[PDB]
RNA sequence: UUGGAUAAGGUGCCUAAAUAUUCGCUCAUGAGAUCCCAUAAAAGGUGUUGGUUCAUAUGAACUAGCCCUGAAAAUGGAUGGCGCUAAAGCGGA
RNA sequence: UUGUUUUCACUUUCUCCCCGCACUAAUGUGGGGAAAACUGGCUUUAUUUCUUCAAUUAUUUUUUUUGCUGAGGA
């Protein structure tokens, strides 16, 4: 809302709730970059969402399909269109809000180590009954003709290993910082020690 | 460091409007860390400054501020209505305003 | 106000006895007509 | 009997009930307006004094808002010269709002119109 | 006290009689006790039931005293019994009812939400009659027997519900669903 | 017949995935609603969601009924009778000092730190800042020395 | 409708298990066990000196309480299946053309011929670790067996539907590849 | 005209205001979603819950809420759109 | 043709015992019995700030922080 830009990991996020929240942020003026859109999940069976997308696919302008609704198959573009359908893109302010949004499949280069945020209002674990049926946007998009799911998965696993390496570096950095803190506490004057102790610092 | 702030951040949301109908006398304002009406009521009567930049100087200065104050809360999600000396230009939605400590 | 609360208790307990006896009569009539 | 019968035909468009003393006092003190002008030229005026009350009723010895409340609650011998003398109250909309103007106050579903009996004091002092 | 959880039902008891007429020089007096949303609502329901069961209304009925005979202890824990009668979109059906709460006021009212949710029976279609007290062992309902068992337990796997204070939109990372 | 050691060890070793039995006698601190911030006792259970939670006079909470959705109970427990009333509640609470045994866990310590941190005046806020400043001085001094 | 359901599954002597987050890992005689049952809300209690499993379901409503029964009898039943192999009674049938078998590559990638006389190729597989091989007692009989209950049963399942013909009344032409009875080693 | 408060109606985004609280029901391989209003019927329903009647925790019959079949039309298509299933659906409070 | 009056059957427990004897969800359970009653209620005595004094209604009196308005000119 007030940050320069918010990066959202779309993994395990319900499409409609995520789109509504993101669109509200764009309208309020907060720049949003959405990553890993191919792990967005949609309520209802995968066959149900496949039928819905087939019904959307069979729909085009009869006279000239060029101006027909550009269907788009990438999950990032699907999320972008869902967000666009949530805000007044026909107006200037709505167009600005729409252009204030970036969507990516996987995690591209300038999103390796900026904090990916998660909005619990759109989590599957909190917004869907466990015994009910859900889908996966990457799988649905591959079914409707994306043919890039596997490449994103291989890039994601390579990124997993890459990030794990420097997380293992960071944990040792933090646990040496805490132990130097333990010894530096007793080099501070006692009255300054008391305030830190009783304020939990 | 330098350049103290001692104010709270706010975003200019839409006018005090309904569906397909506005009332530009009041402008809706969102505040940095307020999310309920019960503490949105805390910032009532406080001065509100909208500070913006002009293309060219007007008093040897490229900066102009229009004043106002928050009258009462709007809804129950930490949104307020602010009345300004003039009407907030609609080119300024989503911009930043200062909710000042004084009064 | 012990006397006043006692009188109120007496009136309320008369109400309670009336309700209990009405319950008894309702049950007796239902039992009689059940067969 | 007569006015109750004539009001029953208009029940679905009004809500009515017991006023009680504090509420009648509030209504007369903060919303009470009085026809001070001459017959058929009444020129609605807020009370703000007892001079007009005495001018219209002093010869009939019910002069004073003290007496007007003293008389409106317990319906004594002078209701003609009190109700008709008093301008119709122009109330504000309820502070918290109506429940359903379309439905009766007496139906199990939320509703407004009908006889609130003793429950109209809260509505009046919310609307005042 | 929390207003959101509470309903709006209190105790009352108002006594009267049909009008003594020339034909009926000495009419008998009668009474009955129900609770509803308001005292006026309960009076209207009582007069409706009087018109449905006998022949009398405000035109031929009057009341001669009013009191609020509240319960012995509203903080008690009870098990009572009433009789339900309702109508569907094609007929009418009847049964009994019993439930546990602190007092009769909500004991009357916990049923309407269940009825509306299950059978879509709006409150204008249900009739509740003859409130009394039930036993704890005589209940043949499935759920209510374990209510007064000697010892019982189950987990708390319900989803969290935080304040508007702390229902922060952007989270540092994904929360879990274990708690405790 | 009785077996001792195996049952005694497996009670601890079973590591059952669910804990905090809802038996009468537990302590509670509400999570949602106007009453989030008070300490009470789970007197009994009335249904699946609604439960009976009542405080002690020392803690000062009247009788209440709350849905299970808004709850977060405590690990303590006393051994009162099922019908024990406010005369015995104030005795059984002080019999074992039910509050003392809680405010040392991680969550309790965090809550106390937050409670004493938000109520911090400007003077102690600046004291915390200055203590952090001196601690950072020592940080960098010995970090440079460690090379 | 009540709030707890459970099945006190009896652990036989010849099996040792370890539960972890609805992922029970077990060791018997022919091998080890594991299972992906993450669809269903299941909690498990375990003991190993006194044995017996307790698979439970909290807030047990008959809407899904028919699943704990399935998983519980299934659990005891894979215990039995891995301890002692299960044997269904599969018999090939042939009204006119006796069934031609080409058991190529050790119970893996079997081929079927001589069924109505098509004289073509027909090959149907099965899950690895499960045998469906000729019983020497009778030629037209195959002694199906394997590691686990589902392991044997899906193999006994897929095979029947492999060679179906067309336009021939099966009320009169009783051709098929049948499975009749169940026994143990 | 300036403030306040409301009516009808709404409070997931479009769109100002509840991803509000509380209790149930429903999974639809064409779910459903505000009077007029923008169609749906006879005939089938051991899912859910609660009943009623009967024969010694044991079997039936019905009953009615949601869901399903019945249910096919021509430019591509419309709960207003997006979408929504721990509802943003239905019946309450 | 109402009233009135009468009988048993009801509750607490970390009580205890025995049988399945560990079969408990638990630091127990299924069944059959003993215990007092630390549950509980009943009447009192000085006190309600050790501790509750609730809720609703009727009748009164204040209070924190603040929005908008200043007609007139006797």
Automatic annotation (TrEMBL), chain B:
**GO biological process: what's one of them?**
cytoplasmic translation
The organism's place on the tree of life at top rank = Eukaryota
Instruction: Quote a single Gene Ontology cellular component term.
Output: large ribosomal subunit
For this UniProt entry, the molecular function terms from Gene Ontology, in alphabetical order, are: structural constituent of ribosome
Q: Which UniProt keywords apply?
A: Ribonucleoprotein, Ribosomal protein
Q: Does the keyword Ribosomal protein apply?
A: yes
Which family is this sequence assigned to?
Answer: Belongs to the eukaryotic ribosomal protein eL33 family.
User: Would you tell me the protein name for this molecule?
Assistant: 60S ribosomal protein L35ae, putative
Entire protein: which part is shown?
A: 35 to 137 of 140
Automatic annotation (TrEMBL), chain C:
Q: Where is the composition biased (Basic residues)?
A: 22-35
Chain coiled-coil ranges: none
**Entry's family note:** Belongs to the universal ribosomal protein uL4 family.
This chain's protein is named Large ribosomal subunit protein uL4
Source organism (scientific name): Plasmodium falciparum (isolate 3D7)
| Entire-sequence positions represented here | 361 to 395 of 411
TrEMBL record, chain D:
Protein name stated in the entry: 60S ribosomal protein L7, putative
Q: Where is it found, in Gene Ontology cellular component terms? A: cytosolic large ribosomal subunit
Alphabetized, the UniProt keywords read: Ribonucleoprotein, Ribosomal protein
Among the record's GO biological process terms, what is one? Answer: translation
Q: Which GO terms describe its molecular function?
A: RNA binding; structural constituent of ribosome
Q: Which family does it belong to?
A: Belongs to the universal ribosomal protein uL30 family.
Describe which stretch of the whole protein the shown chain covers, with first residue, last residue and complete length.
Answer: 130 to 257 of 257
TrEMBL record, chain G:
Q: Organism's domain of life?
A: Eukaryota
Q: Where is the Large ribosomal subunit protein uL6 alpha-beta domain?
A: 11-84, 110-176
- Gene3D superfamilies per UniProt: Ribosomal protein L6, alpha-beta domain (3.90.930.12)
Ordered alphabetically, the record's keywords are:
Ribonucleoprotein, Ribosomal protein
TM region(s), chain numbering: none
List the GO cellular component terms.
cytosolic large ribosomal subunit; large ribosomal subunit
GO molecular-function terms, A-Z: RNA binding; rRNA binding; structural constituent of ribosome
Give GO BP annotations, semicolon-separated.
cytoplasmic translation; translation
Similarity comment text for this entry = Belongs to the universal ribosomal protein uL6 family.
Stated name of the protein: 60S ribosomal protein L6, putative
Organism expressing this protein natively: Plasmodium falciparum (isolate 3D7)
């Amino acid at each position: 809302m007030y940050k320069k830009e918010y990066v959202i990991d779309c993994k395990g996020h319900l499409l409609g709730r995520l789109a509504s929240l993101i669109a509200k942020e764009l309208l309020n003026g907060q720049r949003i970059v959405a990553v890993r859109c191919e792990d967005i999940n949609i309520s209802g069976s995968l066959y149900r969402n496949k039928l819905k997308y087939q019904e959307f696919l069979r729909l085009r302008t009869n006279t000239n399909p060029k101006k027909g609704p550009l269907h788009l198959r990438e999950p990032s573009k699907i999320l972008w269109r869902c967000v666009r359908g949530m805000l007044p893109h026909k107006t200037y302010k709505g167009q600005l809000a729409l252009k204030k949004l970036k969507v990516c499949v996987g995690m591209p280069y300038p999103y390796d180590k900026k904090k990916k945020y998660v909005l619990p209002s759109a989590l599957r674990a909190f917004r869907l009954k466990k015994h009910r049926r859900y889908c996966r946007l990457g799988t649905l998009s591959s079914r409707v003709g994306w043919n890039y799911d596997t490449l994103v998965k291989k890039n994601e696993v390579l990124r997993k290993q890459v990030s794990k390496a420097y997380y293992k570096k960071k944990v040792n950095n933090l646990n040496e910082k805490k132990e130097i803190k333990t010894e530096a506490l007793n080099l501070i004057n006692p009255e300054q020690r008391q305030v830190l102790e009783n304020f939990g610092y | 460091l330098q350049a103290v702030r001692l104010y709270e951040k706010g975003v200019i949301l839409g006018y005090k409007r309904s569906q397909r109908n506005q009332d530009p006398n009041f402008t809706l304002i969102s505040i940095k860390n307020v999310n309920t009406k019960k503490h949105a009521q805390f910032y009532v009567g406080k001065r509100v400054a909208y500070v913006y930049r002009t293309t060219k100087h007007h008093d040897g200065v490229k900066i102009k501020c229009i004043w106002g104050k928050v009258c009462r809360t709007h809804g129950n999600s930490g949104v307020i209505r602010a009345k300004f000396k003039t009407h907030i230009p609609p080119k300024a939605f989503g911009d930043r305003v200062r909710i000042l400590m004084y009064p | 106000k012990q006397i006043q609360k006692k009188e109120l208790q007496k009136i309320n307990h008369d109400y309670y006895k009336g309700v209990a006896k009405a319950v008894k009569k309702k049950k007796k009539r239902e039992e009689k007509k059940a067969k | 009997k007569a006015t109750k019968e004539m009001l029953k035909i208009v029940e679905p468009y009004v809500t009515y009930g017991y006023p009680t003393l504090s509420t009648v006092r509030k209504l007369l003190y903060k919303r009470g307006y009085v026809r001070v002008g001459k017959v058929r030229r009444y020129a609605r005026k807020k009370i703000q004094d007892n001079a007009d009350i005495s001018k219209h009723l002093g010869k009939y010895n019910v002069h004073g808002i003290e007496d007007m409340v003293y008389q409106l609650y317990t319906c004594g011998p002078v209701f003609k010269k009190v109700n008709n003398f008093l301008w119709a109250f122009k109330l504000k909309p309820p502070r918290k709002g109506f429940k359903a103007k379309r439905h009766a106050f007496n139906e199990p579903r939320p509703g407004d119109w009908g006889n609130r009996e003793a429950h109209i004091n809260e509505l009046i002092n919310r609307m005042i | 006290i929390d207003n959101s959880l509470n309903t709006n039902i209190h105790q009352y008891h108002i006594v009267g009689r049909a009008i003594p007429t020339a034909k009926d020089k000495n009419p008998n007096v009668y009474r009955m006790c129900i609770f509803a949303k308001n005292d006026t609502n309960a009076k209207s329901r009582f007069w409706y039931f009087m018109k449905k069961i006998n022949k009398l209304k405000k035109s031929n009925g009057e009341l001669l005293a009013c009191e609020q005979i509240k319960e012995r202890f509203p903080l008690r824990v009870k098990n009572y019994g009433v009789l339900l009668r309702y109508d569907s979109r094609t007929g009418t059906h009847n049964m009994y009812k019993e439930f546990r709460d602190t007092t009769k006021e909500g004991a009357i009212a916990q049923l309407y939400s269940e009825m509306a949710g299950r059978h879509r029976a709006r409150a204008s279609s249900i009739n509740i009659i003859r409130i009394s007290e039930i036993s704890s062992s005589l209940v043949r309902r499935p759920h209510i027997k374990q209510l007064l068992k000697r010892r019982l337990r189950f987990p708390a796997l319900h989803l969290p519900t935080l304040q508007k204070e702390y229902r922060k939109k952007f989270a540092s990372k994904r929360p879990s669903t274990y708690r405790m | 017949v009785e077996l001792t050691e195996e049952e005694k060890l497996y009670i601890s070793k079973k590591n059952l995935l669910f804990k905090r039995f809802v038996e009468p006698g537990r302590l509670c601190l509400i999570e949602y609603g106007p009453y989030a911030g008070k300490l009470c006792f789970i007197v009994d259970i009335v249904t699946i969601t609604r439960v009976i939670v009542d405080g002690a006079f020392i803690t000062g909470v009247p009788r209440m009924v709350i849905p299970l959705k808004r709850l977060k109970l405590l690990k303590e427990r006393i051994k009162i009778n099922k019908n024990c009333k406010s005369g015995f509640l104030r005795k059984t609470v002080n019999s074992t000092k039910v509050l003392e045994e809680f405010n040392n866990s991680k969550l309790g310590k965090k809550m106390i730190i937050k409670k004493k941190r938000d109520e911090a005046t400007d003077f102690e806020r600046f004291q915390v800042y200055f203590a952090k400043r001196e601690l950072k001085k020592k940080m960098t001094t010995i970090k440079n020395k460690k090379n | 409708k009540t709030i707890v359901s459970t099945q006190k599954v009896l652990i036989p002597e010849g099996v040792k298990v370890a539960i972890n987050a609805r992922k029970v890992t077990v060791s018997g005689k022919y091998g080890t066990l594991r299972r992906s049952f993450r669809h269903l809300p299941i909690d498990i209690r375990l003991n190993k000196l006194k044995k017996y499993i307790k698979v439970v379901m909290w807030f047990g409503v008959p809407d899904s309480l028919a699943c704990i029964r399935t998983v519980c009898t299934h659990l005891k039943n894979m215990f039995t299946g891995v301890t002692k192999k299960f044997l269904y009674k599969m018999r090939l049938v042939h009204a006119h053309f006796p069934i031609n078998s080409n058991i190529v590559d050790n119970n893996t990638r079997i081929e079927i011929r001589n069924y109505l006389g098509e004289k073509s190729v027909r090959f149907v597989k099965a899950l690895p670790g499960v045998v469906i091989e000729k019983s020497p007692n009778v030629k037209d009989e195959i002694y199906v067996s394997g590691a686990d209950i589902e392991n044997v049963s899906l193999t006994a399942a897929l095979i029947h539907q492999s060679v179906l013909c067309r336009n021939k009344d099966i009320r009169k032409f009783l051709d098929g590849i049948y499975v009749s009875e169940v026994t143990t080693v």
